[PDB]
Amino acid sequence: HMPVHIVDPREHVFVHAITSECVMLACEVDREDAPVRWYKDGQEVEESDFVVLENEGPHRRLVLPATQPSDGGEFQCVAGDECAYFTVTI
Numbered sequence: 375h376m377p378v379h380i381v382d383p384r385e386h387v388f389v390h391a392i393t394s395e396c397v398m399l400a401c402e403v404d405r406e407d408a409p410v411r412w413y414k415d416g417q418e419v420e421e422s423d424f425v426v427l428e429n430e431g432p433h434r435r436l437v438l439p440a441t442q443p444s445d446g447g448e449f450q451c452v453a454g455d456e457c458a459y460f461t462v463t464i
Contacts, residue, residue, distance in 0.1 A: 383401065
């Protein structure tokens with residue numbers, strides 16, 4: 375069994391956002407066995423009324439309808455061995 379390597383995205387992800395914008399992040403892994411967890415500046419993103427985590431096999435999503443200055447940080451999608459980095463700027 376091979377550990378895990380995130381196939382998408384393969385770069386530093388700069389997101390420009392505003393308070394009246396909707397930031398829908400996406401991270402796809404190689405193996406359906408090992409899904410990523412989304413982290414809000416290390417805190418880890420939890421399921422809330424306005425913070426929704428959409429998941430379907432290898433595909434992992436973070437949907438934020440009204441992207442607040444509160445949500446203006448770096449989101450780290452941790453598979454285990456490998457992690458992709460998303461810098462959101464309000």
